[PDB]
């Protein structure tokens, strides 16, 4: 039967891929990086505490002016914050309080959010009316919306629980490209600086490098033992760092098609909710269910430091494009800005 | 006198205005009762919604005696529960709707499975979840008007071969209720309210009010040290 023939051939292809990856394992990062000086100790201090949410904070995204924050909570409120003074810019009531994602457009004109409504709501912050209106509702998913990022002001990228990612044209509300091929729930996206390639992590113990222009998967990365919750890109676009429930962070190379670095510690048994990089790529940050955020040295796989100002599970993190602060959310309704 | 410029004083006034409005919205939301509505497909969730005068999550607001309930019907979602249920940690109650006829009728595409067995597996998966250890469960068993005939024709041994009782409403119902409750391994800390209803029972709302009132009293009594 061709049913087994095809799957047997697929197994042969998986073996060929494994062998092609092993053929390139002529070295490891943990051998080269032993000769470079250590990152040292990173003692970070709380600089700002942002209060005003009354419920769990699920998502954050920094703008590209490095000053504004978007903070979404399940209290049906999405807040645009001025990070330099703790002043609040904008309070936005939502049509559905069950929000899990948020985004600030790179230009600041538009804000995305959504969650357990299968609709991604896009709000327009700069109107002649002066109020904050719903500019577009993006419907079409059959599952929950897990992460939303902007590609440009006219193009939005979504991830959903129906085992797919999508590229929406914000002016029409219709899908133009749909990225299928996942078997588990898709939890979080990261967008390359080059706008041309995006990475999708899923609750299948897998991550994919998707070409956004053609609508096809370019590279399937494996290695995780459990569901992946968070992904980010290396500043150069050639590597991404992922985090999962297995208390491990992993760095993957988009050019070698291999797992490249494993970040783990004997004292870490809690799942990971969010991962981000500093501008220089030397520091890998991750928020853990153990009520803190750890800062890892990407090169040596040591623990450079900890941030322990939260009383509950740490949710999404954000790092400004300038490197001039790390913003940490939590389920205790406070945001903290660490520099 | 405060080192701040005019526009920043104005923005701070805006911030305080927004903070007051958010606090008012919080005060209103905290006087609302949140209920998580779960159950198997074709369990009659629409029948409870209609009787109580109540894609994605279906949120409905229903008020009784000036107290407000927000019922969240999630049965239309298709995703792994362990990832999205964390947003429901702070509810006061979970309503679980089950059809009794499920004992001798198939819901799943697998004819071997008894949809009452899958419903009680779901009930165990919820009741003993690490997010609902102090969140009470209100269980509604529907379609008793249709159930007497199944009892006359189909003893429960199809679903529970170790039923030794007679083919009557009361004994079979007691056995089923007990089998559902016995999946709760936290008997000392979490209560289960069970009500038998039918198409003509409008008392469902009064029952929900009574059970929610008991939930709030139990939680307040355990907080103040009388429990």
């Amino acid at each position, epitope marked *: 039967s061709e049913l087994d023939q095809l799957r047997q051939e697929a197994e042969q292809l998986k073996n060929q891929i494994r062998d092609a990856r092993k053929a390139c394992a002529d070295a490891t990062l943990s051998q080269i990086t032993n000769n470079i000086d250590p990152v040292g100790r990173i003692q970070m201090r709380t600089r700002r505490t942002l209060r005003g949410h009354l419920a769990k904070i699920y998502a954050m995204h920094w703008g590209t002016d490095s000053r504004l924050l978007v903070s979404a909570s399940q209290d049906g409120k999405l807040i645009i914050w001025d990070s330099y003074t703790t*002043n609040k810019v904008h309070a936005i009531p939502l049509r559905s309080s069950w929000v899990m994602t948020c985004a600030y457009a790179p230009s600041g004109n538009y804000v995305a959010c959504g969650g357990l409504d299968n609709i991604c709501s896009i709000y327009n912050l700069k109107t002649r009316e*002066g109020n904050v209106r719903v500019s577009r509702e993006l419907a079409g998913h059959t599952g929950y919306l897990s992460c939303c990022r902007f590609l440009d002001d006219n193009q939005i990228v979504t991830s959903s629980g129906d085992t797919t990612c999508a590229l929406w044209d914000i002016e029409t509300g219709q899908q133009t490209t749909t990225f299928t091929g996942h078997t588990g729930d898709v939890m979080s996206l990261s967008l390359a600086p080059d706008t041309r390639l995006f990475v999708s992590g899923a609750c299948d113990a897998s991550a994919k490098l998707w070409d956004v222009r053609e609508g096809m998967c370019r590279q399937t990365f494996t290695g995780h033992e459990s569901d992946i919750n968070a992904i980010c890109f290396f500043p150069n676009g050639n590597a991404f760092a992922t985090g999962s429930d297995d208390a491990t962070c992993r760095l993957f190379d988009l050019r070698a098609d291999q797992e490249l670095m494993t970040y783990s510690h004997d004292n870490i048994i809690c799942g990971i909710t969010s991962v981000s990089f500093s501008k220089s790529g030397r520091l890998l940050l991750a928020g853990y269910d153990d009520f803190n955020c750890n800062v890892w040295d990407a090169l040596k796989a040591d623990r450079a430091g900890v941030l322990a100002g939260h009383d509950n599970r740490v949710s999404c993190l954000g790092v400004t494009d300038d490197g001039m602060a790390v913003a940490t959310g939590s389920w205790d309704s406070f945001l903290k800005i660490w520099n | 006198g405060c080192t701040l410029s*005019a526009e920043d004083k104005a923005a701070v006034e805006r911030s305080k205005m927004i903070d007051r409005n958010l606090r008012e919205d919080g005060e209103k939301a905290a006087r609302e009762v949140k209920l998580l509505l779960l159950g198997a497909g074709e369990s009659g969730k629409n029948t409870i919604v209609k009787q109580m005068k109540i894609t994605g999550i279906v949120e409905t607001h229903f008020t009784f005696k000036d107290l407000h309930f927000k019922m969240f019907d999630v049965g239309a979602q298709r995703s792994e529960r362990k990832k999205w249920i964390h947003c429901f940690e702070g509810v006061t109650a979970i309503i679980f709707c089950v059809a009794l006829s499920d004992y001798d009728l198939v819901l799943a595409e697998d004819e071997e499975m008894n949809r009452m067995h899958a419903s009680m597996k779901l009930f165990d998966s919820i009741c003993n979840n690490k997010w609902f250890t102090d969140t009470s469960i209100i269980l509604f068993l529907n379609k008793k008007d249709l159930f007497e005939e199944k009892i006359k024709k189909s003893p429960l041994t199809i679903c529970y071969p170790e039923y030794a009782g007679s083919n009557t409403y009361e004994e079979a119902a007691a056995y089923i209720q007990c089998q559902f409750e016995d999946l709760n391994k936290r008997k000392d800390t979490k209560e289960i309210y069970t009500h038998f209803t039918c198409a003509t029972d409008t008392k469902n709302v009064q029952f929900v009010f009574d059970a929610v009132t008991d939930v709030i009293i139990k939680n307040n009594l355990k907080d103040c040290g009388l429990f």
Partner: single-chain antibody
Amino acid sequence: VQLVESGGGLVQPGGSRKLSCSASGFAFSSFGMHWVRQAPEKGLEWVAYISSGSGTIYYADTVKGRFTISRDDPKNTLFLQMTSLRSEDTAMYYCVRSIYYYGSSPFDFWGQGTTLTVSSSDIVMTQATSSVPVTPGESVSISCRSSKSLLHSNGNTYLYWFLQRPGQSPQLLIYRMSNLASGVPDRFSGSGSGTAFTLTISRLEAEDVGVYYCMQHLEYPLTFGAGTKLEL
């Protein structure tokens, strides 16, 4: 987006009037507002600022104790109660919307104005000239001076440029020296520091030609420049 002022006309000295600004097309209660006095022979003068809520109300030194602002958010309206009017108070009055936050657009919309003919430290800014001839198609550079530096330690400047077309209410042209208002084509710009600022204009169109005014938002009370008229 409409602002309708009313309640003007001829008043005898010593009397009082109630002017009314009717707001439509925006979230009035979310905005602060200004009333601005314009004397046909003198130009723009700031009168008063009402907060979006019940916050501090600022008045010009020349009207304090005589004029009051009443605000009715549920109706999106403003009222000016003018007591003890003097012949110096004869003027056109403008209702102006504003909002103050990071990236906000203060002073970005002015009403049509209502005329109230009446019978019979601080910081000063100056205009380089009250009038200058211009040639269509060529660029123009309009400079503006202040008695105090407009750059605050927070890095921002508070110099506003306004354009008043003949027969029309003045429009907001530039925010904080370099930020263009929505709807303005990429022909206008400005720069400077301290007490010397310049408005740079590319090729002139007939739709541009009017009187340009400086406004300083550093501290209340607010002031205006003399105003430079372009003659085509």
